Amino acid sequence: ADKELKFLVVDDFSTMRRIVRNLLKELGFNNVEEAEDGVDALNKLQAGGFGFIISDWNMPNMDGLELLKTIRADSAMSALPVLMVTAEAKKENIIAAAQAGASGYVVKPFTAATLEEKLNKIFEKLGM
Amino acid sequence: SQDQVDDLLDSLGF
């Protein structure tokens, strides 16, 4: 996948966003922006150019699942890669993610090596 | 159930 792929990292917790941004940097992905919830994410997505989304499950105003479904049903953004982040792997949340078309699913906290595996799984499936 | 979860993730390519 291109080193310059533009990521949007979505989480209401600023520290987690910084952590994810820094793990991405460690993997060679420097083109990264932040959003604090689904509403803020959709506003930033309007700038165009975004190539990858990493979103937390639980956020105010619009949570991760709502954002995922919105992107998937959007005329322009429907195929955008979306990695969902959760606090705990639960059958019901995994299946909710599957049903809505999550490109990936990962439990926080995660290492750079785990992030890399998950991104590579997605790149491989999408031929990126 | 842990194993149903890991299998579920595997089947989904997650």
UniProtKB/Swiss-Prot annotation, chain A:
The keyword Acetylation appears for this protein: yes
Main localisation: cytoplasm
Alphabetized UniProt keyword annotations: Acetylation, Chemotaxis, Cytoplasm, Flagellar rotation, Magnesium, Metal-binding, Phosphoprotein, Two-component regulatory system
A single cellular component GO annotation: cytoplasm
Quaternary structure annotation from Swiss-Prot or TrEMBL: Interacts (phosphorylated CheY) with CheZ (via C-terminus).
SUPFAM superfamilies in the cross-refs: CheY-like (SSF52172)
One Pfam family of this chain: Response_reg
Cofactor dependency: Mg(2+)
Effect caused by changing N58A: Diminished rate of phosphorylation
Cofactor note: Binds 1 Mg(2+) ion per subunit.
Entry protein name: Chemotaxis protein CheY
Domain Response regulatory: 6-123
Disulfide pattern: none
InterPro entries the UniProt entry points to: CheY-like_superfamily, Sig_transdc_resp-reg_receiver, ST_Response_Regulator
Function: Involved in the transmission of sensory signals from the chemoreceptors to the flagellar motors. In its active (phosphorylated or acetylated) form, CheY exhibits enhanced binding to a switch component, FliM, at the flagellar motor which induces a change from counterclockwise to clockwise flagellar rotation. Shows autophosphatase activity which is enhanced by CheZ.
GO function term, MF aspect, one: metal ion binding
The species this protein was found in: Salmonella typhimurium (strain LT2 / SGSC1412 / ATCC 700720)
Residue positions binding Mg(2+): D11, D12, D56, N58
Record bears the keyword Ubl conjugation: no
CDD domains cross-referenced by the UniProt entry: REC_CheY_CheY3
Residues the record lists as N6-acetyllysine modifications: K91, K108
Subcellular location: Cytoplasm
Modified residues (4-aspartylphosphate): D56
Gene Ontology terms describing biological process: archaeal or bacterial-type flagellum-dependent cell motility; chemotaxis; phosphorelay signal transduction system
PTM per Swiss-Prot/TrEMBL: Phosphorylated by CheA or acetylated by acetyl-CoA synthetase, depending on which acetate metabolism pathway is available. Dephosphorylated (inactivated) by CheZ.
Gene3D superfamilies in alphabetical order: 3.40.50.2300
Xref: PANTHER family: TWO-COMPONENT RESPONSE REGULATOR, TWO-COMPONENT RESPONSE REGULATOR ARR22
Curated annotation (Swiss-Prot), chain B:
Superkingdom of the source species: Bacteria
Null allele phenotype: Cells lacking this gene display a strong clockwise motor bias; in combination with a yhjH disruption and overexpression of ycgR, cells switch from clockwise to a counterclockwise bias.
Cellular compartment(s): Cytoplasm
Family the entry assigns: Belongs to the CheZ family.
Subunit-structure text: Homodimer. Interacts (via C-terminus) with phosphorylated CheY (CheY-P).
Role description: Plays an important role in bacterial chemotaxis signal transduction pathway by accelerating the dephosphorylation of phosphorylated CheY (CheY-P). Acts on free CheY-P.
Protein name: Protein phosphatase CheZ
Covered residues, full protein: 201 to 214 of 214
